[PDB]
Amino acid sequence: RFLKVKNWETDVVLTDTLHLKSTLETGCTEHICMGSIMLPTKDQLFPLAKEFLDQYYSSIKRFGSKAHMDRLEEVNKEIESTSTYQLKDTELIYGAKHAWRNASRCVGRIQWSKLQVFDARDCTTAHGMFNYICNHVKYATNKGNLRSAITIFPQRTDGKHDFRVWNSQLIRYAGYKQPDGSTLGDPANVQFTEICIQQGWKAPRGRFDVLPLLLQANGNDPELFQIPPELVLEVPIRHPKFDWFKDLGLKWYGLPAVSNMLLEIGGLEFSACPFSGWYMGTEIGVRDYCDNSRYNILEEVAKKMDLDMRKTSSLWKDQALVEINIAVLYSFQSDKVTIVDHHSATESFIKHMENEYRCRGGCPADWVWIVPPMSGSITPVFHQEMLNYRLTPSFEYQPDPWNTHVW
Amino acid sequence: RFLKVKNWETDVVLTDTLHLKSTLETGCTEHICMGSIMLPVRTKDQLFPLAKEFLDQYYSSIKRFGSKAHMDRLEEVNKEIESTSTYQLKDTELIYGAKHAWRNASRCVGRIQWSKLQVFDARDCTTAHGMFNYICNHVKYATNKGNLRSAITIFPQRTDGKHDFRVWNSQLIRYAGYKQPDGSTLGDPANVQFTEICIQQGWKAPRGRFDVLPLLLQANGNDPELFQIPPELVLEVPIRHPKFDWFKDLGLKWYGLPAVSNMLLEIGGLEFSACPFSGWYMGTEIGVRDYCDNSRYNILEEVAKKMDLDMRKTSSLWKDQALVEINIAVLYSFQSDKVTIVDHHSATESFIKHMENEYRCRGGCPADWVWIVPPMSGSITPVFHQEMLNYRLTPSFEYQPDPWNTHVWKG
Ligand code: HEM
Ligand code: HEM
Ligand SMILES: CCN(CCc1ccc(NC(=N)c2cccs2)cc1)Cc1cccc(NC(=N)c2cccs2)c1
Ligand SMILES: CCN(CCc1ccc(NC(=N)c2cccs2)cc1)Cc1cccc(NC(=N)c2cccs2)c1
Ligand SMILES: C[C@H](O)[C@H](O)[C@H]1CNc2nc(N)[nH]c(=O)c2N1
Ligand SMILES: C[C@H](O)[C@H](O)[C@H]1CNc2nc(N)[nH]c(=O)c2N1
Ligand SMILES: [Br-]
Ligand SMILES: [Br-]
Ligand SMILES: [Zn+2]
């Protein structure tokens, strides 16, 4: 019930107690482990509200103070009366930072406390949402010196008035199914690209077309908007040894910004909460570029490198993978856009885990996601045992809005 | 209840009913997942249910379920248990049993091969010399001059837990490790403790970087004894690279037969505490883990210096570059010397075909993702994109404590 995690490379043992706060469920049982599965009223509200306010007042060392009790009473009255409640700004910021803190799939959490929070709970229209988003994009990009931020739109009410950003990220490239049977651009986004097209977006039909924003305020039909191109920092992909690399015509965007998740603070649901930090190199170089169902470029790169593609045992895929990833890192660095390599990031995350064990009594962590998708065992996180469990405040998945929305 | 797993590259969705037969516990609850934790005498009482269930499975597999032959076996095992407190497996049931423990091994990527396993029955063995003899035959049969064949050798089962058969070595063939006075290690650091026990026990150590350890063998609960495997029986492969001629000069080699000797085989409640098994290597076991773990041979820096890579910053991916070259070298060397080896692309693809087949014919395939995904190039192997259900079936291979931790010394 008090649990140990061993690092097998260093022999460091940490004891976890934080897990006994865990509220939500895992998907696992005594009989079956689901560790590798991607997707495992008033009466409900006050327990959640109290639990949250309890940890908040404890975090500022006012647990059991009149001010703590007072607020608990105030929120309680508000629920009884209104059937919801409003977070004070301080609680909103704390809620947000802690949802990041608690994200067991995020390797980048050593940074969790420095999050910039933009309160957009006063927003009412998709145009308003567009303005808030552009401000977020500009603030976060910061000419390439990227800064973490989240923008928080109004919370769910009756569920027929949801704020949603339909995009999966604020900045992503379009995907077009072609007569040839194949795909141009990013195949991950073919469906959303079609929803933009049927909405009225004139598509340049290129390999790297920045998608429009499809923004939904107060449960209305969503509206198209183009992000000013001056706000979208992009990096041309070259290699520091291979001259021909640039001829592949590869680029990526500097700002990863997740816009389809749901933020839960003290029972309150924020269905539009775009957040952004910066890239770990492998996301682009391993996953975006090399996934068979993404840009899938390994074949082409291997050719240009003139490697023996006749047998899998030459490790030509492996060779090409490394080079592609050297180039991503090299390009971002050359252009002065913040990026982290998988070595540095996993080293940080070990140091973060340590702090959290010492300061919090633990750190929920999902090994399957935390281990980078290349060179697993030569990064320290591979050798590190991790306990995975669900703490609130949290980010959660929610269905793609077009399966839900009533037009 | 039906459980679905999805492959996110192909959208193939499979359905699992086999987890329904899962008895043992995972280490997880509804509130915690322990999916990355490395390690998460029986009385008459619990023995007969374990026996029955196993014999029910065995007789189902041979399409004799509910037969006269089935019923009589059940009754005979039952009589034998309560009379003697244990029971003896028939040859056919032992064979079926060992094969299933491999089939059920959720951490094993090489399971496509499960039905071709040579079972050697060493239950008539009584002494350490007898064990040495069975193990040589095993090593020679499995080696097969480089055309590796899977085999397991099964020594007598546990009785009162005071007469255990054990192989003290963790693999039959493995290199010594020697902690030096300056705090450095010579040879394989994973094997320092076992190496010191061998020295204590009287092994005169050559003290090089690649000394094949002697066998330390425990028969019948007696103090273990030392034996050297005939060198002519130990197939080894010098490691060279197909383009970098200085690679050979690093002085690396590895042995060709990987043979695990420290696990416990459980069949119908019976515990076989010495059951060495062998197959062949996936290249990354040597190239990634044995060569490049910081706590093992740790050659990344020396390799990368020799390749004159930029070592001043990790974002040069010097480590990742060196790692690929080492792994090419490992596979090239084995293939050139005609020693069976499999690369991680080829073995993960076979595993996915194995797994789909297992779903269709068997109704499932317990698989531990943390273990199945290779320790380099994860997402360019199809297993990374495969969802897996992990659960424990019997027969099974289990961990057991190192014998020096439990053994009662006689003198
Ligand atoms: C500061 C730089 C950051 C780095 C380098 C970083 C790194 C990562 C990486 C590599 C993933 C895996 C993504 C994937 O494979 O799809 C991830 C997942 C996640 N990150 Fe972080 N992160 C950072 C900042 C943040 C911030 C600011 C938040 C929220 C405020 C956050 C919340 C999450 C969540 C919720 C997931 C899981 C997404 C999912 O389950 O689909 N990240 N992060
Ligand atoms: C045919 C050749 C084989 C290949 C290429 C293969 C591949 C592997 C690999 C790569 C591992 C992970 C080892 C590690 O990281 O420590 C493994 C684990 C395992 N394999 Fe297989 N294997 C093969 C044959 C067999 C045989 C014949 C058995 C037993 C009959 C077996 C049972 C297991 C077990 C019990 C584990 C888990 C070890 C542990 O949990 O510590 N393997 N196998
Ligand atoms: C919610 C989407 N996440 C990725 C979220 C994400 C988080 C982090 C990053 N990278 C970053 N560096 C940051 C982004 C924001 C701050 S840091 C990028 C993306 C991927 C995901 C998770 C679970 C399931 C799926 N499902 C799917 N792949 C599909 C849906 C439909 C067809 S396939 C995708
Ligand atoms: C029981 C030993 N296994 C390795 C077993 C193994 C299985 C398979 C192979 N490789 C093969 N290809 C085959 C061997 C036999 C048939 S196939 C090699 C080894 C490793 C292990 C498992 C669980 C805990 C530990 N604990 C440990 N002591 C450590 C691990 C790392 C640093 S210390 C070790
Ligand atoms: C099936 C498996 O759960 C799935 O492919 C996971 C594995 N690990 C991952 N890890 C990260 N960081 N991101 C991912 O999308 C995935 N996908
Ligand atoms: C902590 C973690 O579970 C541990 O390092 C595991 C990870 N995956 C592994 N996978 C395999 N095949 N072999 C291993 O030794 C390990 N080690
Ligand atoms: Br980071
Ligand atoms: Br195989
Ligand atoms: Zn689990």
Side-chain angles (χ1 to χ4, degrees):
Chain A
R1 190 177 130 90
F2 289 34
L3 291 169
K4 305 130 73 79
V5 283
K6 181 173 182 166
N7 182 293
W8 286 86
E9 184 209 313
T10 52
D11 286 322
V12 175
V13 181
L14 304 170
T15 311
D16 185 300
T17 47
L18 187 68
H19 73 285
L20 296 162
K21 289 323 280 294
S22 179
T23 164
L24 303 153
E25 275 166 34
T26 62
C28 296
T29 80
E30 276 100 306
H31 292 265
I32 198 154
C33 179
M34 289 207 165
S36 77
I37 310 285
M38 293 220 74
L39 317 166
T41 32
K42 301 189 180 195
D43 294 6
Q44 312 183 119
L45 193 51
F46 195 63
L48 298 163
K50 170 142 190 307
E51 180 218 323
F52 168 77
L53 291 170
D54 285 1
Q55 72 190 70
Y56 172 73
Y57 273 90
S58 147
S59 79
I60 70 172
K61 303 178 299 150
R62 256 142 186 85
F63 191 87
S65 70
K66 186 136 187 315
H68 177 197
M69 305 302 104
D70 281 345
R71 160 106 279 229
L72 222 48
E73 158 84 343
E74 190 194 22
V75 159
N76 187 279
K77 283 187 165 201
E78 187 169 329
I79 291 168
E80 272 295 337
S81 171
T82 71
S83 47
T84 187
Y85 73 107
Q86 298 306 313
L87 301 166
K88 297 264 181 256
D89 294 350
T90 58
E91 301 164 347
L92 187 77
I93 292 150
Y94 172 93
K97 285 180 184 187
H98 281 75
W100 187 8
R101 204 182 186 171
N102 297 332
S104 77
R105 288 180 168 177
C106 175
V107 69
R109 286 178 274 171
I110 192 174
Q111 285 306 290
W112 74 272
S113 75
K114 305 197 289 288
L115 184 65
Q116 179 60 221
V117 178
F118 296 109
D119 181 358
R121 291 174 291 168
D122 74 349
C123 186
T124 64
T125 56
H127 276 91
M129 289 177 79
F130 171 70
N131 184 49
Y132 270 113
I133 285 162
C134 295
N135 289 349
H136 180 139
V137 171
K138 185 171 213 181
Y139 173 84
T141 302
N142 188 31
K143 297 177 196 253
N145 192 186
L146 304 200
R147 292 171 298 193
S148 305
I150 184 161
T151 295
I152 305 163
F153 291 108
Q155 73 209 34
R156 173 166 302 150
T157 52
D158 54 20
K160 270 155 68 170
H161 285 59
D162 287 4
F163 288 75
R164 298 283 313 255
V165 172
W166 283 38
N167 308 68
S168 58
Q169 295 187 26
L170 295 176
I171 297 163
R172 253 192 155 181
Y173 299 124
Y176 315 88
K177 250 276 209 302
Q178 291 196 310
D180 319 326
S182 59
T183 291
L184 177 59
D186 191 342
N189 300 314
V190 169
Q191 184 176 13
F192 179 69
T193 300
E194 287 192 284
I195 298 158
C196 299
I197 287 165
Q198 77 210 195
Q199 269 312 148
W201 184 61
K202 305 197 87 166
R205 297 200 85 89
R207 210 185 174 199
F208 293 108
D209 302 358
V210 178
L211 280 169
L213 292 170
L214 236 199
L215 298 181
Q216 174 191 323
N218 220 218
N220 302 310
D221 300 342
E223 298 181 42
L224 284 180
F225 299 90
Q226 204 85 61
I227 306 175
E230 57 270 28
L231 303 186
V232 186
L233 176 54
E234 289 174 301
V235 182
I237 306 307
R238 59 280 189 197
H239 194 282
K241 291 268 275 167
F242 299 97
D243 284 319
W244 53 259
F245 208 94
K246 68 149 183 309
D247 296 342
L248 303 171
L250 308 158
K251 60 174 133 185
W252 208 251
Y253 50 93
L255 191 78
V258 173
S259 65
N260 61 182
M261 293 183 91
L262 182 145
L263 165 62
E264 192 203 310
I265 297 160
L268 300 178
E269 293 188 317
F270 298 94
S271 51
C273 60
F275 57 90
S276 73
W278 58 77
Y279 268 117
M280 178 167 70
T282 48
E283 289 184 73
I284 303 163
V286 184
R287 303 301 313 281
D288 295 333
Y289 283 167
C290 297
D291 272 8
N292 183 266
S293 59
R294 298 285 307 287
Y295 279 85
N296 184 222
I297 68 174
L298 270 179
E299 293 222 356
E300 298 88 277
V301 172
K303 277 170 157 54
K304 277 269 188 90
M305 288 176 70
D306 211 28
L307 307 155
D308 187 25
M309 283 175 72
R310 289 179 290 186
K311 296 164 300 83
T312 70
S313 40
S314 65
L315 312 196
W316 67 267
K317 283 178 172 173
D318 309 68
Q319 261 175 319
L321 183 67
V322 178
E323 300 302 335
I324 294 156
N325 279 274
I326 281 171
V328 169
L329 288 173
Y330 176 74
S331 300
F332 269 64
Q333 286 169 176
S334 287
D335 282 353
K336 234 73 54 46
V337 182
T338 311
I339 196 159
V340 69
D341 63 73
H342 53 289
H343 301 292
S344 159
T346 57
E347 191 207 342
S348 294
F349 179 81
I350 290 295
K351 188 196 190 211
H352 172 64
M353 263 188 82
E354 262 132 55
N355 298 316
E356 296 291 70
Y357 271 85
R358 162 175 27 88
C359 300
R360 221 191 170 188
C363 176
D366 179 348
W367 197 97
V368 167
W369 274 63
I370 303 284
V371 178
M374 73 176 282
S375 300
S377 69
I378 63 158
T379 65
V381 290
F382 185 90
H383 305 270
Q384 176 65 61
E385 300 182 340
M386 302 173 185
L387 287 164
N388 187 208
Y389 49 89
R390 309 226 315 175
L391 295 175
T392 185
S394 61
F395 290 103
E396 304 294 340
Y397 305 125
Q398 50 179 358
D400 279 337
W402 51 89
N403 306 308
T404 330
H405 187 71
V406 276
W407 283 85
Chain B
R1 200 195 317 98
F2 298 75
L3 289 173
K4 273 141 250 160
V5 298
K6 174 176 179 174
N7 186 291
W8 289 85
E9 195 153 64
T10 59
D11 285 347
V12 179
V13 174
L14 301 163
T15 304
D16 181 295
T17 52
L18 185 67
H19 69 286
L20 294 181
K21 309 293 208 213
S22 184
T23 103
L24 306 165
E25 290 188 25
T26 67
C28 306
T29 80
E30 308 94 88
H31 289 114
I32 212 150
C33 175
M34 302 223 306
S36 68
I37 302 308
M38 192 101 83
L39 324 156
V41 43
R42 258 188 191 95
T43 58
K44 291 177 155 160
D45 204 300
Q46 63 261 198
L47 194 46
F48 191 77
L50 295 184
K52 182 186 203 309
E53 184 209 349
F54 166 74
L55 300 166
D56 290 3
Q57 291 172 200
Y58 168 70
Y59 278 87
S60 289
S61 87
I62 65 172
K63 288 268 138 85
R64 288 314 182 264
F65 184 94
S67 60
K68 222 280 212 173
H70 183 201
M71 298 303 116
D72 293 352
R73 191 44 190 159
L74 274 188
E75 193 179 320
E76 162 191 72
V77 158
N78 192 216
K79 283 169 78 195
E80 187 182 353
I81 276 166
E82 73 172 22
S83 153
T84 78
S85 245
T86 179
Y87 72 105
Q88 297 303 310
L89 291 184
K90 300 300 191 183
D91 284 19
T92 48
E93 287 157 358
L94 185 79
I95 288 159
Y96 171 90
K99 275 174 206 201
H100 281 69
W102 180 15
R103 194 179 186 182
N104 296 338
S106 76
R107 302 184 159 174
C108 178
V109 81
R111 284 177 280 169
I112 195 168
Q113 295 289 350
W114 77 268
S115 68
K116 295 108 192 214
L117 174 63
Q118 187 58 222
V119 175
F120 293 110
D121 181 350
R123 293 169 293 170
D124 62 10
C125 186
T126 72
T127 61
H129 280 87
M131 293 178 62
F132 175 67
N133 191 57
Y134 271 108
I135 284 175
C136 286
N137 294 340
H138 176 138
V139 166
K140 184 173 203 182
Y141 168 99
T143 300
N144 190 21
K145 316 203 175 162
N147 180 197
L148 271 36
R149 302 180 281 199
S150 303
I152 181 166
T153 291
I154 304 161
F155 289 109
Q157 69 209 46
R158 183 173 294 143
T159 52
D160 59 7
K162 290 182 184 153
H163 295 83
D164 292 352
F165 285 77
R166 300 292 304 270
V167 180
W168 283 41
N169 311 59
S170 77
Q171 302 175 30
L172 305 174
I173 311 211
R174 223 187 188 187
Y175 298 118
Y178 310 88
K179 200 141 111 158
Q180 305 270 70
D182 65 20
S184 71
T185 306
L186 175 52
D188 192 342
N191 305 324
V192 170
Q193 208 195 27
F194 175 78
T195 302
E196 274 163 29
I197 287 161
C198 295
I199 293 163
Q200 208 200 135
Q201 298 307 306
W203 185 52
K204 35 264 171 216
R207 313 190 57 71
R209 189 163 64 147
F210 296 104
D211 305 339
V212 172
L213 282 157
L215 288 168
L216 198 36
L217 314 166
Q218 172 181 332
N220 201 236
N222 299 310
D223 293 354
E225 323 177 16
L226 282 165
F227 307 94
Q228 185 208 191
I229 306 171
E232 61 270 34
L233 259 36
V234 186
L235 184 56
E236 290 177 292
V237 181
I239 307 305
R240 60 285 186 180
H241 188 276
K243 303 189 214 326
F244 307 143
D245 190 63
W246 53 258
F247 205 95
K248 71 178 190 300
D249 300 324
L250 298 157
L252 310 167
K253 64 182 163 172
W254 210 250
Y255 47 91
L257 178 82
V260 164
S261 59
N262 63 355
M263 295 182 88
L264 187 148
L265 164 55
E266 199 210 338
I267 301 175
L270 305 180
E271 299 184 312
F272 300 94
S273 56
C275 57
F277 53 90
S278 64
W280 50 82
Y281 269 116
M282 177 161 82
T284 55
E285 300 183 73
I286 315 166
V288 188
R289 307 298 316 280
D290 300 323
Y291 286 167
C292 304
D293 274 3
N294 295 140
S295 317
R296 304 286 311 284
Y297 283 88
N298 189 212
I299 64 173
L300 271 188
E301 287 214 32
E302 191 182 341
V303 169
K305 288 206 288 307
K306 289 239 187 262
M307 298 174 61
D308 188 49
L309 297 172
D310 194 329
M311 287 185 60
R312 278 163 317 168
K313 41 190 150 55
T314 78
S315 66
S316 67
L317 305 201
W318 68 267
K319 281 194 183 177
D320 313 71
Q321 294 198 265
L323 182 67
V324 175
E325 298 307 332
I326 292 161
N327 274 276
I328 285 166
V330 162
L331 294 159
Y332 176 67
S333 293
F334 275 63
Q335 277 155 197
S336 293
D337 284 351
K338 299 130 142 52
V339 183
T340 308
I341 190 157
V342 67
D343 70 80
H344 52 285
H345 300 296
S346 160
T348 56
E349 193 186 4
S350 294
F351 183 82
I352 288 289
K353 301 160 173 189
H354 172 63
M355 189 187 163
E356 299 181 328
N357 188 51
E358 286 285 74
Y359 271 76
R360 281 141 211 168
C361 82
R362 205 188 186 193
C365 188
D368 173 355
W369 197 99
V370 168
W371 272 64
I372 298 299
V373 175
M376 70 180 290
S377 290
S379 82
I380 61 169
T381 74
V383 292
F384 182 95
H385 309 267
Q386 181 66 54
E387 286 184 348
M388 296 171 200
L389 284 171
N390 192 203
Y391 47 94
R392 299 176 43 182
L393 303 171
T394 42
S396 71
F397 289 105
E398 308 285 353
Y399 300 124
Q400 53 179 349
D402 282 329
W404 50 95
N405 283 330
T406 53
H407 181 69
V408 180
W409 285 92
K410 278 94 186 158

